[PDB]
Design a protein around this ligand. Sequence first.
Ligand code: HEC
Ligand code: HEM
Ligand code: HEM
Ligand code: HEM
Ligand code: HEM
Lengths: 247, 385, 385, 57, 126, 93, 93
Amino acid sequence: MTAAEHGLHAPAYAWSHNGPFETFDHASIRRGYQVYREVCAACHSLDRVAWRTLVGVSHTNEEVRNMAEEFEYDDEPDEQGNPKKRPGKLSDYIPGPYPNEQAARAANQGALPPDLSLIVKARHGGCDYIFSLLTGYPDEPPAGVALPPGSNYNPYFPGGSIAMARVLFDDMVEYEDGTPATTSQMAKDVTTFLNWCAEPEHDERKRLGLKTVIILSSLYLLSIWVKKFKWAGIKTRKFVFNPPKPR
Amino acid sequence: MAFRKSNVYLSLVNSYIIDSPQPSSINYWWNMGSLLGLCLVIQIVTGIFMAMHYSSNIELAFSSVEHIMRDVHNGYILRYLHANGASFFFMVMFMHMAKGLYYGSYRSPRVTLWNVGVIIFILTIATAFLGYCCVYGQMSHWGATVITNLFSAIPFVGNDIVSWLWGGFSVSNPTIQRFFALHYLVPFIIAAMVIMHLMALHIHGSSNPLGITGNLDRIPMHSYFIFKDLVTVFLFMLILALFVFYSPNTLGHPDNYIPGNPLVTPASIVPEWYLLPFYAILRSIPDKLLGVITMFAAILVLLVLPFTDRSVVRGNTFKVLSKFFFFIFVFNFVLLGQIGACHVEVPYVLMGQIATFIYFAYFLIIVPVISTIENVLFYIGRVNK
Amino acid sequence: MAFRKSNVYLSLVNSYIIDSPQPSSINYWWNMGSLLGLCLVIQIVTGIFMAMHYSSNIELAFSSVEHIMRDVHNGYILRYLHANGASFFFMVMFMHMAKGLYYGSYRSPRVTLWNVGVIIFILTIATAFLGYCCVYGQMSHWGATVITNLFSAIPFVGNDIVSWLWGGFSVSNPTIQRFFALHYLVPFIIAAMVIMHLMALHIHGSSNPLGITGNLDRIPMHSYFIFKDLVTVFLFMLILALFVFYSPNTLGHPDNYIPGNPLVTPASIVPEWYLLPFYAILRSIPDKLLGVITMFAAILVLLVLPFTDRSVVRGNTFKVLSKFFFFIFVFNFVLLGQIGACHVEVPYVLMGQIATFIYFAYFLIIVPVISTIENVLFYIGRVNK
Amino acid sequence: SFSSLYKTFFKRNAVFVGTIFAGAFVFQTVFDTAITSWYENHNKGKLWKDVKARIAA
Amino acid sequence: PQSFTSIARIGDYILKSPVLSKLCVPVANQFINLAGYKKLGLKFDDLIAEENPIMQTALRRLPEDESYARAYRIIRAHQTELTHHLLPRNEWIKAQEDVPYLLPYILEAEAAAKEKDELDNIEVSK
Amino acid sequence: GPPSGKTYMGWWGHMGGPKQKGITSYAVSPYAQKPLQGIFHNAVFNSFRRFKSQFLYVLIPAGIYWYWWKNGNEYNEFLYSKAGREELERVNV
Amino acid sequence: GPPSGKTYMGWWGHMGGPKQKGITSYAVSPYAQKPLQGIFHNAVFNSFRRFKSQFLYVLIPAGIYWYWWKNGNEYNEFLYSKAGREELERVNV
Ligand code: HEC
Ligand code: HEM
Ligand code: HEM
Ligand code: HEM
Ligand code: HEM
């Protein structure tokens, strides 16, 4: 297919977790949660991330308890059998904005916004794709395209026409640590947060990988030595042939 | 006599792994078999410990896999170990087969060993296809539909065998629960066939890279080849720990993190990377019935090899044209695998057709003609007349 | 030589089932082994064809079992065949073990055969318990609760291992998915141990009901014991077909058709009928650690048997006191099974304690004393001085 | 004294595998602590406790 | 699987031709030199696969001194390949030393077996 | 493979019994015989002989255990009746 | 057990090779040897000998197939671009 149908490839930005000894910037995850809650939570879901997984990664225990209690989940029905509701706890999951898929497609002009809880693993490019898609919206589509109405141009989306309009604008969120919250800074923060939501094992996985790679490299070289020590007597074997006398 | 000989079970263990007389000349390509044994044990153990948490319904399959990833302690280790260990199992199995048809191991004392190997290869392909179908992503679902709708090309009973495979009318809950029960089951058939592989090997013993007899000096397998296998075991675990811990979703496709949706096609349906050459073989034929007949023929053409090898010396160690055309075959297989991952665009259909023809002409045309030419060159280079 | 001997696999088939020399004097109690092999094939095949439709969550286990019973074709045949076939498996296994205990098959050449048999007995007890627990009825939840909660009596580690068995804090969705994966697994371990049972058998051959040597006249297994096996194969199939098609729920308990409820205790918690003697042995000790030790020692007391048999004659064919006390042991086992299905009430606990003492005094007190008395009687009855 | 080193450590296989296991115990402990402290000092200002001290200061 | 009577038939037709020999025997000599079995101290009749009844009878009919030399050359090739080296260049087989020594025995056993099956499938004219 | 240990059963030709001399065995083709010969005589006389020889060993312990079970069952039925509560309390505690 | 067919590998004592005479073999204890002997010499000279003998067989087919893949990939990227649309519309239609 053509380059427009493929989509433009995202370049290789220098993320703070690129590299085998690195770690998510956890302040970037906290700021990215704020940008998700204030902008992305209107249309996209986070169906796989429990509230308890944020405790000790980006927020404190009470800081997560209050954000969970500001929502309302389905309780077990009362003693007369009527349905009940409940303030959220740490066991519950982060609720989406829509009750079903038809409400989503009705609210967003036929297209359904994907759940973002695995979206940097579900897309070729990963963090570079999410960042470059969010900041890739030009001010005008290139001269020649026929964009369908209700759709927007973004060259990193395959085909070009995406049903998400440009959502990130300068200083639409104020961070609580006083960071200048521009478009690029907010896209960096949400992409770090979505990468944490996809791979919440990332730090421990890289740390354990350091341990196994060190132990297994040492074992490999040490086993090369023990193989050469065992096979010394066969590698240094000498054969002499005196031809036997005819009989 | 010794207790390791005067037992029932320790007699078998002694005869196979302790006092087994190996030819002393065998190089590092003779460790792929013990490597495949290690890989099989890895797959079985990690799969059992993930099946303790997997739920197989169509509405619970994908989310049970993410429950393994996010909620089970060290469950990402288990899932990444199972997936990358399956792909490593296939790379090592391709090396085992390429060694076998380089060094002439298929030949006349060991044809039943080669054929039990081909049966093992077919069973591992089936096992990995079912296990990729159990995770129920987007490539998983649509891979299941195109591979099962292959069988609708049989002109009499095709629709009923595909409706018997599906358990219904397309890939849904009976198909996924079936594929889980079978993806458990076929590995234990593979373990039985591996025991039969070892039994067919043990009667004549292994070959050697010279292709001459190895009956003259031999080495017991314990304390020499145990440690020579330990070297490759630690190397294989090192390279697998690299791919599991630092680069885990590299060999996989990203579209298996989209849940399976029967209404949206993912615009390039490709299987896992090791089934790409057979996928390109299937894709090259402009018919579906001939396509599946040619794919099954492409894997059943390993049986015509002990009858088309027309030469008196075993292996390609001392032949130049056999070496050259062997590596033409290997890079034809790699090009076929890369053609199978591309779209059906204009140079690729011709490239896949010509590479499929080269794949079939290797076994049926190239090996007999080159074998006969090398025979008469070996004769007239050294006899005088 | 013949192709059935010259081949790798066909010589194994020949040496085990075709040319295998059996003693000509062996009776119909020697068909129980072939019967148990047929039983194992029945269980494995019907279990696979039900696991193609079974879901193993705590919410869907019971209703998936009735989905098997109601709307999959011939699913009632599969479930009744699996359940009654497991019960018939245990009846035939009890006959196999009681034959071996009658005819002295545990004695001096075949102790490794006896020990691999005891390992097989333990593994199928575990398999049948897990498969009962996968139904998730009312009896299976509370049976799982009682048997798993017995491991809390281990004084330092018991709470950690019962929490590790449960996967949580009571029998729930992790416990049921664990038990399904293990109930699928352990029958393949049983098949491997059956192969090892046969390998230990083949080095010395079967015994014979005289107890004297059978090396003198022997007949091959083909067309004599193949058809003598076929008689009891068809008889077993007939009796199993009666119990599957005309009384399919007689050997069960009706409480398993109530879905599992952690909040209602069913006021009489019993396991399946074949675990009832060990349940009575466990219940008849007024302790918990000593109870679980006594049940496991009741399964492991069968290994003490080759060292406490103090007689020079193999078997009970020609001894009268050994025959009498053997049938005392057999009906003691039946009374123990009948006591294990009764409540903890007044005469039954003394009956269970006395029957437990008779069960353990058979192997440890009755057999040595009676066998040396029989030795001295055999001597002084026929020598004169 | 290589003869004394051999006679204490490598002559009996009971003592040999005993010190193998003792060394594996202490190696596992201090290797774990060394890898965690290096990983945390390499990732300085990025872990949670640094951000927690920042929002507590 | 190509029996040596066919190889000898084609090779004798090539060598007895004036044109075909002067084109093909240089290519065969370069093939033999590139093959590199001589660098491991082996003649070509040590290379032939011996696990059929024809070569088992040919090796059984080979005389005693030739069989001892063949066994030594084989064991030396195994020990050389075990170390991934070659033999020193004075220990290599020369072109005059690379003699066909098993070929008459193979040709005799093959003619015997061919006459055997032609006389097992004999048919009379009556 | 290597030879394993000494067993007590060989194969056809070298079973491992004693040497046999002077024993002659005769047998007729089953195609020249009558199968089911003597089934109506063995079904009534041989069956009675085998039953008469081996029934005290089976039916004396069966009688002992069945009488013990019936007596314990009758006592348990008596203890949980209206007539036998006043023994049930002084029996259990 | 029964005896099976004639194989081509026996066991320790009856391997089935030819009779050996006049071959003496000598070998020293590895506890009296140096392992890792000559590794820095073999790492550069023996590896160069092995590469020099065995690289044309590997890198001529690799070169042919890599040039084929590169040229076909270039033709595809040309035909699905704006400059090469006319040849695309005549090469498929
Ligand atoms: C309101 C409606 C919103 C807001 C505020 C955001 N998104 Fe986005 N999004 C939305 C729709 C309707 C779609 C579907 C468009 C389509 O054609 O598929 C999307 C799409 C995405 C994607 C997937 C793009 C792809 O498939 O390649 C990602 C990733 C995504 N959206 C992320 C995202 C982030 C990180 C936001 C942060 C503030 C965000 N969206 C805002 C609808 C809406
Ligand atoms: C022959 C060896 C085996 C091979 C080659 C194999 C192959 C695979 C593959 C390729 C996958 C897909 C991995 C992914 O993309 O996520 C998979 C998944 C799976 N396999 Fe296996 N498998 C093997 C053995 C087993 C066994 C024996 C079991 C069961 C005990 C098992 C259980 C699973 C499960 C539960 C999944 C679910 C999806 C996941 O967790 O990744 N595997 N298998
Ligand atoms: C589960 C997969 C397999 C296992 C465990 C396995 C195991 C083994 C082992 C242990 C050996 C001996 C060591 C060696 O020679 O490398 C061996 C040899 C062999 N295997 Fe496999 N094998 C497998 C798959 C296959 C396949 C797919 C083929 C080919 C179709 C095959 C063909 C052979 C051959 C020809 C040999 C003999 C090679 C020789 O020694 O010359 N095997 N196998
Ligand atoms: C060792 C042989 C086996 C025994 C003794 C055994 C025993 C049992 C028993 C007693 C039940 C409960 C049946 C009931 O009460 O309704 C059961 C259930 C079950 N077993 Fe097995 N089983 C065996 C082998 C297998 C195997 C190999 C599989 C799987 C492939 C399997 C799959 C099942 C399934 C799915 C159930 C579900 C509930 C049902 O349908 O009854 N079984 N098993
Ligand atoms: C999966 C279950 C089992 C199978 C398939 C099995 C299979 C066999 C077979 C086929 C035989 C030879 C035929 C015969 O003698 O009856 C046999 C013999 C024997 N089995 Fe089992 N068996 C099983 C369980 C057990 C158990 C639980 C024990 C006892 C603990 C046991 C002890 C024996 C003994 C002692 C013999 C030899 C009897 C004799 O010939 O004197 N087996 N077994």
